[PDB]
Amino acid sequence: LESQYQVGPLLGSGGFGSVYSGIRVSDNLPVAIKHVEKDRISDWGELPNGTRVPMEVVLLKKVSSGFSGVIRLLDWFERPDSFVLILERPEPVQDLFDFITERGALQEELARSFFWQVLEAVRHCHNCGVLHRDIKDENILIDLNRGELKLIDFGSGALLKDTVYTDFDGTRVYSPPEWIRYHRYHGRSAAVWSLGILLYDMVCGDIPFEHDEEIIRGQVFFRQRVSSECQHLIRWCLALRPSDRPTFEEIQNHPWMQDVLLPQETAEIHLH
Numbered sequence: 464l465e466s467q468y469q470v471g472p473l474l475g476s477g478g479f480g481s482v483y484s485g486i487r488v489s490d491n492l493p494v495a496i497k498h499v500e501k502d503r504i505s506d507w508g509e510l511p512n513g514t515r516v517p518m519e520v521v522l523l524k525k526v527s528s529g530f531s532g533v534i535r536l537l538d539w540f541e542r543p544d545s546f547v548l549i550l551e552r553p554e555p556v557q558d559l560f561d562f563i564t565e566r567g568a569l570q571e572e573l574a575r576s577f578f579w580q581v582l583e584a585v586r587h588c589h590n591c592g593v594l595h596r597d598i599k600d601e602n603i604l605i606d607l608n609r610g611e612l613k614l615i616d617f618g619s620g621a622l623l624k625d626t627v628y629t630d631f632d633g634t635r636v637y638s639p640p641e642w643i644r645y646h647r648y649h650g651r652s653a654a655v656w657s658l659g660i661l662l663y664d665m666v667c668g669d670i671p672f673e674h675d676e677e678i679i680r681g682q683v684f685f686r687q688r689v690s691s692e693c694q695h696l697i698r699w700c701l702a703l704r705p706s707d708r709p710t711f712e713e714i715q716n717h718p719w720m721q722d723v724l725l726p727q728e729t730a731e732i733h734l735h
């Protein structure tokens with residue numbers, strides 16, 4: 464492990480563990496090296512072989528085949544008291560949260576391109592039987608050269624199911640009112656609610672709700688000029704009743720979602 468990869472600066476640490484910049488020595492491939500303490504691990508999973516690993520590894524393996532807008536797991540190691548994950552690292556890259564901190568509310572054309580790519584990435588996860596459960600700007604990376612977004616940190620996720628979820632460990636201000644009130648939600652509609660929060664976050668420069676009371680009321684106020692079509696999509700995603708929320712298909716067929724830029728166009732125009 465410590466011979467295969469050369470370790471660089473710490474990129475960040477928190478509920479996800481400690482993530483380091485790194486370079487695979489084999490071929491000089493840029494990587495991110497993520498350490499997770501076993502004590503601090505909340506949800507565990509099992510590999511097709513039967514060995515017990517963090518759910519994050521199970522989930523990443525189910526989605527890490529092929530190409531997509533999900534960061535790929537290259538390898539993992541177990542240590543006596545932690546697991547170490549080796550993840551692909553685009554360069555240069557900036558997470559969407561820092562990007563929004565820098566530039567404030569995003570132009571709708573740019574928000575459209577970004578949001579579209581998040582949708583495509585979430586659909587891929589769902590198709591692979593994976594529910595992320597912590598979709599937010601902190602968990603999205605921007606490949607600044609290619610204009611491609613990448614989903615990260617599946618450590619709060621779960622296998623997708625059609626029955627009710629009664630556990631949740633993701634970010635509360637992104638969590639749906641049915642979770643706040645009843646501690647029950649279903650996968651796809653919970654996800655759509657968090658996409659509503661995210662889209663609002665992009666076009667307004669901050670999240671719409673800070674308190675349980677606001678989430679439960681579900682009243683959306685716009686502090687920035689936002690087109691009526693975008694306001695409509697956001698409020699649809701943020702429907703109080705789960706079944707009143709759009710499916711992914713309905714989101715991507717919405718009028719506001721038409722004529723999206725290609726990623727490379729996006730980088731050229733907006734990320735120079």
Ligand SMILES: CN1CCN(c2ccc(-c3cc4c(Cl)cc(C(N)=O)nc4n3C)cc2)CC1
Nearest residue numbers: 474475479482495534550551552556557615616
């Ligand atoms: C000053 N620069 C800021 C942007 N930058 C950078 C590089 C990598 C990351 C990064 C990649 C990455 C990956 Cl692939 C996974 C995870 C994770 N949490 O699983 N985190 C990552 N970070 C922070 C963030 C910022 C390089 C230094």
